[PDB]
Amino acid sequence: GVDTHWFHRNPLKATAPVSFNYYGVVTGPSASKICNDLRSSRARLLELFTDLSCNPEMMKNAADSYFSLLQGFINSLDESTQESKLRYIQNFKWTDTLQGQVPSAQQDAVFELISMGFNVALWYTKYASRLAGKENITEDEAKEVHRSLKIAAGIFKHLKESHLPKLITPAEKGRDLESRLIEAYVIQCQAEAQEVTIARAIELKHAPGLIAALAYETANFYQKADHTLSSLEPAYSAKWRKYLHLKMCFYTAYAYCYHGETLLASDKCGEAIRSLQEAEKLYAKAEALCKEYGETKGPGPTVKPSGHLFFRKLGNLVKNTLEKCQRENGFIYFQKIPTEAPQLELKANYGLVEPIPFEFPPTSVQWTPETLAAFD
């Protein structure tokens, strides 16, 4: 009843386990305790990423618990112009979504806050894609897919705007913390969330003009994400870019389809037919890209999306809508079919997805000047 969606996913990030043991540096019960609490809250959060029973409430509770403690290594307790003396005490090491098994490390607690935050965002995108793929998916689950993607978008955007600029040592090219990847993730999250919007708008029976505009803006996001990545080495970006390009073509086909409905409703049947013919072309291009995606090596599972329900449903809509327009033209309108496809310049008046703003929790109250003093 509610439609499924297929979202390509790169792998979650992995990290070296961290004991938070500073040996002689740390003295006394409270600093020792806070180190134990850092160790166990980090471990609990990491375990959740692969725990199939995890839901957003659990994730948010675990994330808040760890991030509030970790921030004692970052934030000053008494001045927004100052920083924790502990920022550089611990080396943290992480793999990256496109880099396979080759990790990278920094001795900077901000690098950890951002890397782990990035994995929390990825978790929300994977919870969304897992729900979106269920043949039995419900209305509440669709709402959760949409919300989770917007939450992820807001986390990635917050990291990019407010935390990445703090790193005195930048991430190397191709890594999640460089300029290009994180921006592509923000955009992709918006585009994916907007697919769900389009399905809901259709279900809620909105005008085809709104549907077409949302489809067009969705295609535009996917195109923009694709371009954002296009300067990366093809070896590790090609598969992801095939997905983005495939979705761009797909939603452009959607746009031409609903734009055809709008034209037909305006009694321009000839133009509607030409719009649907362009939808056929874009749809065929998307099918070709799906085959290429299925043949392209890179991060994530081998997949063949042209066989998926989402894909085949659009194919049927295009075919049926085109046939409808042809019948209208033959019985009712008798209009010439223009030679050139319409130039789409559609702007959605409603429904455009924006990230849900994210902020980290405040520094844990476990951090006190006495506790801080016990690190020497």
UniProtKB/Swiss-Prot annotation:
Residue list for modification N6-acetyllysine: K285
GO cellular component labels: extracellular exosome; nuclear envelope; nuclear membrane
Domain called BRO1: residue spans: 92-376
Processing and modification events after translation: Farnesylation is required for nuclear envelope localization.
Keywords: Acetylation, Lipoprotein, Membrane, Methylation, Nucleus, Prenylation
Keyword Lipoprotein: yes
Membrane topology label: Lipid-anchor
Secretion signal, residue range per the UniProt entry: none
Listed Pfam families: BRO1 (PF03097)
Alphabetical GO biological process terms: mitotic nuclear membrane reassembly
InterPro entries given in the database record: BRO1_dom, BRO1_sf, BROX
Location relative to the cell: Nucleus membrane
Subunit structure comment from the entry: Monomer. Interacts with CHMP4B. Interacts with CHMP5: this interaction allows the recruitment of BROX to cellular membranes. Interacts with SYN2; this interaction promotes SYN2 ubiquitination and facilitates the relaxation of mechanical stress imposed by compressive actin fibers at the rupture site.
Role of this protein: Nuclear envelope-associated factor that is involved in the nuclear envelope ruptures during interphase (NERDI) repair, where it is locally recruited by CHMP5 and reduces cytoskeletal stress through its action on SYN2 to help reseal the ruptured membrane.
Family according to the record: Belongs to the BROX family.
Name by which UniProt lists this protein: BRO1 domain-containing protein BROX
Organism listed in the record: Homo sapiens (Human)
Underlying gene: BROX
